[PDB]
Amino acid sequence: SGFRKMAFPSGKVEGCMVQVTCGTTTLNGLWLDDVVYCPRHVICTSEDMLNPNYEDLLIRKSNHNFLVQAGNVQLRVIGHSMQNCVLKLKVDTANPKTPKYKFVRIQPGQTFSVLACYNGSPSGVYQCAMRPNFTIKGSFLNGSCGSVGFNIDYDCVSFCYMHHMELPTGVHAGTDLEGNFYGPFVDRQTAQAAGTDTTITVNVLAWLYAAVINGDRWFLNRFTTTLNDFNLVAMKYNYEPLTQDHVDILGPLSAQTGIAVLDMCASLKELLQNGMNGRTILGSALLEDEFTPFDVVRQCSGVTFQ
Amino acid sequence: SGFRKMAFPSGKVEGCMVQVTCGTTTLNGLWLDDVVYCPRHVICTSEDMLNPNYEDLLIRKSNHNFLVQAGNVQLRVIGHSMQNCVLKLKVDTANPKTPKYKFVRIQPGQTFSVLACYNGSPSGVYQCAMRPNFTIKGSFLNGSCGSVGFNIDYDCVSFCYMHHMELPTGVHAGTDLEGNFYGPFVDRQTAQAAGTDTTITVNVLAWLYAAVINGDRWFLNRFTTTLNDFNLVAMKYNYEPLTQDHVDILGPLSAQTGIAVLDMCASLKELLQNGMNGRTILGSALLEDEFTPFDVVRQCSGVTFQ
Ligand SMILES: *[C@H](O)[C@H](C[C@@H]1CCNC1=O)NC(=O)[C@@H]1[C@@H]2[C@H](CN1C(=O)COc1ccc(Cl)cc1Cl)C2(C)C
Ligand SMILES: *[C@H](O)[C@H](C[C@@H]1CCNC1=O)NC(=O)[C@@H]1[C@@H]2[C@H](CN1C(=O)COc1ccc(Cl)cc1Cl)C2(C)C
């Protein structure tokens, strides 16, 4: 037993990370087959990153302007092109470490592992959720652009995120691996802001089920509630509405614990109105919302990946 | 910016994990050079694990009783020996993936990354602290024994932990890689219990400095305190005593923020006596104690590993 914010093993992704330097900008790239993927603002400079015109900037570039460091070995760039907000640098060598992979775009509420990287070298790994406002609460410093987020499903890495920027509230924004931003953000230095977030209701319920599975039961009660009456409380506390599909997705957790989904909602209702009163749930004094039902089933059952 | 519970990249360790099966017990082993390391209770059975005599049990074993699966390839065991609570299985093949490594024993209060494994296959990675009572609050199910904890320091993996068991409170106990248990636990099924824990004071202060670096400042104050008067409050709230060396270790964080260590103690004192009053620190409603000063400096500065 026990319950931890757990990332996927990062080894398959570590073998794809490279360093991309252009001008005085160094960031990370993702090397799959004979392509290196990286944020397009690597082609920018100081006075560029204001309201840049990346098509103009890119046509002024040459293959040899892009220095690609795969560890202690330089990769020759033989072509370049822009795809939305990412660059695709064609290199003369296919990555012999290329795992089988997919480029997937995730939904707010879903989670993924981030391999934070600097100068092409992995620094750490942690779990993030896509917030309802399409930001992520990460840990990113200068030089971390091009770090990717991913999930693993048996032997296949599903890349879902490339890091591009921090917003003024300290949260982070980036793209899918096709270069399309999550949320209404642009890779310019403007006065853009996150905008209002909500709590991921279905995830909080999943985490409550994780707690019960692990022996935290004090928040349970004989009360129940209808979906509609629960959702008026959710709205009041800036929680996302709970749909019937969310109830369906929680079914296996409900069946394992023997606590009906709607009964757990009644428990969440009471926690929202009364707080916790000095008690904790799974070592937390806050209702946690960055674990999906899948995450709970995976950890409380022990799935692996080859 | 941002602050996350961050593990080390796990790739170097993933290449060492194997499956060890003996009788009807399957667990994980750690394959370094031509030795596989695993918990010695793999040689036990159901009626064995009560008050077993492992020397007697081991002399009754044969090299061929140990099935070692390195992925889809079987490793021939050519020798075996017991070292305290671990087995060393000599195999005919050296692991060509062996990273440079060390076997180190850590102190309570220090942190490490755990690569949770089942059937020799990595499942996830997360950060743990050695509690003052020599347990760890992990996430471990049946089959996870032999998963290791580790730190990475440039290119070198310092293995500090092998998993053996869960205690009745849901916390976890294991050994260093020389097979010596952390704390007063034995690899028998007895009525052993964790015993009383304390909060790691120096780590809480480090995390408060992490908060300030990341813009959470509401808990700061003009008050100060002496080390002695702080330590009477620490004792009252079941916090570990703060030593002058702890103050020294916090020096760089103090110097970066411009908040004297003893002034941050005064802030912790007030948080201990008043609570947080509905506010959070780094997304937590509890004082967090599983980040060392090193962890904070590493994350709030961006060190990597090759
Ligand atoms: C690429 O390595 C960086 C990663 C940034 C640096 C600090 N934290 C990060 O995640 N990306 C950028 O520097 C991008 C780049 C231009 C601006 N930018 C930003 O991150 C915006 O800036 C900030 C905004 C808010 C904060 Cl709290 C901090 C910073 Cl540095 C492009 C937008 C072109
Ligand atoms: C080896 O894979 C397991 C790992 C255990 C299983 C559940 N969680 C874990 O970390 N190790 C064991 O089964 C060891 C083994 C005998 C008993 N044992 C225990 O973990 C003790 O048991 C438990 C105690 C408390 C709880 Cl809450 C659950 C269990 Cl299963 C040796 C002590 C020989």
Swiss-Prot record, chains A, B:
Effect of residue 145 to A: Complete loss of 3C-like proteinase nsp5 cleavage
Domain Peptidase C30: 1-306
Subcellular location: Host cytoplasm; Host Golgi apparatus; Host nucleus
Residue ranges annotated as Cytoplasmic topological domain: 1-306
Covalent cross-link (Glycyl lysine isopeptide (Lys-Gly) (interchain with G-Cter in ubiquitin)), residues: 5, 90
Regulation: Inhibited by pyridone-containing alpha-ketoamides compounds 13a and 13b. In turn, alpha-ketoamide 13b (tert-butyl (1-((S)-1-(((S)-4-(benzylamino)-3,4-dioxo-1-((S)-2-oxopyrrolidin-3-yl)butan-2-yl)amino)-3-cyclopropyl-1-oxopropan-2-yl)-2-oxo-1,2-dihydropyridin-3-yl)carbamate) inhibits SARS-CoV-2 replication in human lung cells. Inhibited ex vivo by michael acceptor inhibitor N3. Inhibited ex vivo by compound 11a and 11b.
Reaction(s) catalysed by this chain's protein: TSAVLQ-|-SGFRK-NH2 and SGVTFQ-|-GKFKK the two peptides corresponding to the two self-cleavage sites of the SARS 3C-like proteinase are the two most reactive peptide substrates. The enzyme exhibits a strong preference for substrates containing Gln at P1 position and Leu at P2 position
Source organism superkingdom: Viruses
Entry annotation: catalytic residues: 41, 145
Subunit structure: 3CL-PRO exists as monomer and homodimer. Only the homodimer shows catalytic activity. Interacts with host FBXO22; this interaction promotes the proteasomal degradation of nsp5.
Stated role: Cleaves the C-terminus of replicase polyprotein at 11 sites. Recognizes substrates containing the core sequence [ILMVF]-Q-|-[SGACN]. Cleaves and inactivates human TRMT1, preventing tRNA guanine(26)-dimethylation of tRNAs. May cleave human NLRP1 in lung epithelial cells, thereby activating the NLRP1 inflammasome pathway. May cleave human GSDMD, triggering alternative GSDME-mediated epithelial cell death upon activation of the NLRP1 inflammasome, which may enhance the release interleukins 1B, 6, 16 and 18. Also able to bind an ADP-ribose-1''-phosphate (ADRP).
Descriptive protein name: 3C-like proteinase nsp5
Gene name of this polypeptide: rep
Section of the entire sequence shown: 3264 to 3569 of 7096
